[PDB]
Design a protein around this ligand. Structure first.
Ligand SMILES: CC(=O)N[C@@H]1[C@@H](O)[C@H](O)[C@@H](CO)S[C@@H]1OP(=O)(O)OP(=O)(O)OC[C@H]1O[C@@H](n2ccc(=O)[nH]c2=O)[C@H](O)[C@@H]1O
Lengths: 11, 698
């Protein structure tokens, strides 16, 4: 659990 | 009022579109509809260029019209979905897609479009299902094939890996050549075995997506300033990021706007995203000379004006092709100099981007042909971390001896020293140096807390905190927004690590691993009998797959240990338990690199060609540990194994990292900033001289 912010594509 | 007339006009417009001339296509479509308003296909076609032009508002109205006329037009539902998606209305777009599939069970784009929503909600097994269905129906579908490929990548499904890769390249080759926008997303391009020209070419195309979205504003070029007179001798730098909030980008550079020299520079921050409420956002707003919320200004025209209004000399793009980006801003060219920085690990491939900020280790001059921008070198590494400010409680540590290991039971805290002073029998190992508590009632109390899984205890009045419960004791300290006000215990037993093992960790998202990368580790683990590999459930669906491939390479289950994802502070801190970090060479640990180094944990890397596969090396160089940098698979394995067997050598290196992280420039934001300032002024002089940008490689 706990999710954390990460980088990702522009979709 | 003639259908035939209109029909011909449509035929003409479709022609004009093919010859890439968008301007004209629209004009014709609009006349076709003037002649015959009840024209379904005209409405549909005019919609999708309006969509391309970013005029969604309107493009939607026309799609709605198309449907009303032809209720079986499955193709229009699907597109209207895409539009509604792009309008942040996921709900209604989802409705379109399903509605389309219901009407035409066999229509393949709907099935893909649906999968794509699932992908963005991060439910992957469902996204995959729907992509597989789409491809079954239409076995030649790039967009679906590529997107699938990426999901399989994220879950570490490596079935037919080599054929899948070749196939990708294959598709991209075709699409680049047929002048069609490539299915691979530039941010993912670094994961596949494409050429560097190919990667640049992809980026290049997404570069042109913004270009069309702004052409339709019909804006005159901007008059840029030519000297510093209006800004009183100050160079006006503008940072533009959608991640001034709780987000890695902030975790790295939140200190920097604060650290600029006010005499020579005036700092403008342009948030692309609304205030999330966190301390990161607050600090940046508190410390930048000016903070402008551009999320209040959705129109790219008025936004760009607002930048040019402010008189920015250097505009810094921190997003590149990542979530929440708005490069239309950059395409409008409001500042004379526009540089890529930190946020995106790759070339923009775009004309409107002047410089990429990097260094010689990450982007050596041989490979300048990979980028479309001119290189601007920082003197050490272009990377940087706030860790020093964000996590000062990790500067020093203390250990319990429970039978001298530095990573079995650890204690950190701002007030650690005063607590050790309360204690009767502490022993002081030299390296700074490392305090060791002996196995007494005290030590036993602490360990029993850990064992019973209790939140916290009190010893001589100091609070001792279970380092698994921090979000309960203090939410803000667990996220990295506050500095912890207690002492925190961290131990191997908390994560089910074997007390007497060699722990190789890698804390990255699992998409960074490929079958090669795993093979190497498999080898290493075989040659080092007391070892375990420590990974993250990131995502959890990923775990069984690795376990699978690990088992086929001949590893018992108990050889690889998975831990769940943790909040930033716990995540960083438990890096101290590990012995060596083993870095993914397909795509390096970036923020993670900094994180594991801060814990004093040496990291083995094998630098490749792509920027992103080189960052870790670049960090280690700056730190001063070249013996951790491998020239090939072979050497990689050996460096690891040497560390894992030669406990004397291990201790030597670990101590080096520990010391170096302070004394080297790596975690030094003040020094970093000043260099960034140098590089800024270099760029400026050169442009003020009358020159177009060239390499600043010094
Ligand atoms: C390949 C790639 O996209 N690289 C990007 C860089 O080029 C950008 O410069 C960096 C942002 O600008 S982010 C990015 O760098 P990466 O290292 O890939 O980080 P990523 O996007 O996987 O998220 C890891 C986060 O999870 C946190 N994290 C991780 C595990 C955990 O248990 N808890 C936790 O808080 C970590 O502390 C991090 O906060």
């Amino acid at each position: 659990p706990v999710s954390v912010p990460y980088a990702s594509a522009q979709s | 009022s003639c259908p035939t007339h209109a029909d011909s006009l449509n035929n003409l417009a479709n022609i004009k579109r093919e010859q890439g001339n968008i301007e004209e296509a629209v004009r014709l479509y609009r006349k076709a509809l003037e002649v015959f308003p009840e024209f379904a296909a005209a409405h549909s076609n005019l919609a999708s260029v309006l969509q391309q032009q970013g005029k969604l508002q309107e493009a939607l109205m026309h799609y709605k019209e198309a449907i009303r006329i032809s209720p079986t037009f499955a193709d229009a539902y699907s597109n209207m979905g895409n539009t509604l998606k792009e309008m942040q209305d996921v709900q209604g777009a989802l409705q379109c897609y399903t509605r389309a599939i219901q009407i035409n069970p066999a229509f393949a784009d709907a099935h893909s479009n649906l999968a794509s929503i699932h992908k963005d909600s991060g439910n992957i097994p469902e996204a995959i299902a729907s992509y597989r269905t789409a491809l079954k129906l239409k076995p030649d579908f790039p967009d679906a094939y590529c997107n699938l490929a990426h999901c399989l990548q994220i879950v570490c499904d490596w079935t037919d890996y080599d054929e899948r890769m070749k196939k990708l390249v294959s598709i991209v080759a075709d699409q680049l050549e047929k002048n069609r926008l490539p299915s691979v997303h530039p941010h993912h391009s670094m994961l596949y075995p494409l050429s560097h020209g190919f990667r640049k070419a992809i980026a290049e195309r997404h570069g042109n997506l913004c270009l069309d979205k702004i052409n339709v504003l019909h804006k005159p070029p901007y008059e840029h300033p030519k000297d510093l007179k209006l800004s009183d001798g100050r160079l006006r730098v503008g940072y533009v990021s959608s991640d001034f909030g709780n987000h890695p980008t902030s975790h790295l550079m939140q200190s920097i706007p604060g650290m600029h020299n006010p005499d020579k520079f005036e700092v403008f921050c342009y948030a692309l995203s609304p205030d999330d409420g966190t301390n990161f956002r607050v600090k940046v707003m508190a410390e930048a000379n000016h903070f402008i919320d551009l999320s209040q200004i959705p129109c790219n025209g008025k936004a760009a004006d607002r930048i040019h209004q402010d008189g920015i000399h250097i505009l810094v793009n921190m997003n590149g092709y990542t979530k929440g980006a708005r490069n239309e801003l950059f395409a409008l060219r409001p500042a004379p100099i526009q540089a890529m920085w930190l946020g995106y690990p790759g070339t923009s491939g775009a004309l409107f981007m002047d410089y990429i900020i990097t260094d010689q280790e990450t982007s050596p001059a041989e490979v300048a042909e990979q980028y479309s921008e001119k290189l601007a070198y920082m003197p050490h590494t272009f990377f940087i971390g706030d860790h020093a400010n964000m996590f000062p409680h990790l500067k020093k540590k203390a250990v319990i001896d429970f039978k001298i290991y530095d990573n079995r039971i650890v204690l950190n805290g701002i007030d650690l020293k005063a607590f050790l002073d309360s204690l009767p029998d502490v022993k002081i190992v030299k390296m700074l140096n490392m305090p060791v508590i002996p196995m007494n009632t005290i030590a036993e109390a602490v360990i029993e807390m850990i064992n019973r899984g209790q939140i916290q205890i009190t010893i001589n009045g100091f609070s001792i905190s279970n380092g698994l419960a921090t979000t309960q004791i203090n939410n803000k300290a667990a996220t990295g927004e506050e500095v912890p006000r207690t002492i925190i215990v961290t131990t191997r037993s908390q994560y089910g690590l074997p007390e007497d093992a060699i722990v190789y960790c890698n804390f990255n998202q699992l998409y960074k691993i490929d079958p090669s990368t795993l093979q190497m580790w498999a080898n290493i683990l075989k040659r080092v009998p007391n070892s375990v590999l420590w990974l993250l459930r990131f995502p959890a669906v990923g775990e069984p797959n690795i376990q699978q491939y690990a088992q086929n390479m001949g590893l018992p289950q108990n050889r690889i240990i998975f831990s769940p994802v943790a909040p930033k502070e716990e995540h960083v801190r438990r890096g101290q338990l590990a012995d060596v970090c083993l870095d993914t060479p397909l795509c390096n640990g970036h923020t993670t690199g900094m994180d594991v180094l801060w814990a004093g944990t040496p990291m083995v890397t094998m630098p490749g060609e792509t920027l992103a596969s080189r960052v870790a090396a670049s960090q280690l160089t700056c730190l001063g540990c070249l013996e951790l940098i491998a020239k090939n698979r072979q050497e990689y394995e050996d460096i690891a194994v040497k560390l894992g067997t030669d406990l004397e050598y291990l201790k030597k290196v670990r101590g080096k990292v520990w010391k170096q992280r302070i004394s080297s420039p790596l975690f030094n934001t003040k020094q970093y900033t000043m260099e960034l300032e140098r590089l800024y002024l270099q760029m400026w002089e050169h442009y003020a001289a009358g020159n177009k940008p060239d390499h600043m490689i010094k």
